[PDB]
Amino acid sequence: MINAIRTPDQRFSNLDQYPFSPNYLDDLPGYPGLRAHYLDEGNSDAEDVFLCLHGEPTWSYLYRKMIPVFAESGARVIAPDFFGFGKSDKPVDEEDYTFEFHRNFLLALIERLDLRNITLVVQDWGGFLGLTLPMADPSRFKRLIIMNACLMTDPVTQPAFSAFVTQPADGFTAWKYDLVTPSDLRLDQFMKRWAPTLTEAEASAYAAPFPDTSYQAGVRKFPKMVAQRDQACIDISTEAISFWQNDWNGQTFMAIGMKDKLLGPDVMYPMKALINGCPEPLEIADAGHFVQEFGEQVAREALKHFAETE
């Protein structure tokens, strides 16, 4: 229905620090003909599941230093690549990627594998979609590890989650420029600029899925979805506040990447207040937007808090 393409498998031969075996589902409901990739790691029978959600413009490769810490703890880690990202398939047209289209895919993935005992792990778009999951089926979520993210709300009801779109000009205005404007978007240069600590090898891992620009339509639509929020996304995200503030009784863990210009403190302190029971965040001073690149430290501490309150 949705014309889509798939990335040559050879694009991933040389990945650094990605020894994970691939799994695929290609029959989600609503998602015909489309194949999705996801990591399934650790004891595939563990009580606890860490569902790890990626954001713009990355993939599961992102969680790569986190995954094993979670597996070695005795958890099963799921870690899906969205349609248009990593190893999943990619619709060719930006008109096909919407907020529901990626959200429904999430709910579909969750039903299908039947996950329970979830410790939701979000950042970026992964949190924007991922934080609307719980109210869908509350009985299946038990914890949350939230890194630099928030809810796509409409200006009035939460100004902090709209404000960063316009100011600073070297924050979200700059991120969106680097993404939707180049005719020749090199995600290795982009990442090396938004994450100065990456090595040339890592950076190249984030361009692997995209050989040419026709593979990038979903890379392209995401910043624009931050900018232009449709009604469903507003209603849904508005409905999520209420759930995190009044319904949620789960355990949480927050880590802030203080060097972030898009979603640092301005956005994280206000989120910390709407999550019923969210404790004193963990401020990572040398980290940017991609907190997961100071990942092990997060994964470790997140599990250390997790047990000290069980």
Swiss-Prot record:
Chloride binds at residues 125, 175. Pathway: Xenobiotic degradation; 1,2-dichloroethane degradation; glycolate from 1,2-dichloroethane: step 1/4. GO terms for biological process: 1,2-dichloroethane catabolic process; response to toxic substance. The active site is at 124 (nucleophile), 260 (proton donor), 289 (proton acceptor). It catalyses: 1-haloalkane + H2O = a halide anion + a primary alcohol + H(+); 1,2-dichloroethane + H2O = 2-chloroethanol + chloride + H(+). It comes from the Bacteria. Signal peptide: none annotated. It holds the Pfam family Abhydrolase_1. Inhibited by thiol reagents such as p-chloromercuribenzoate and iodoacetamide. Keywords: Detoxification, Hydrolase. HAMAP family: Haloalk_dehal_type1. PANTHER family: AB HYDROLASE-1 DOMAIN-CONTAINING PROTEIN, HYDROLASE-RELATED. This is Haloalkane dehalogenase.
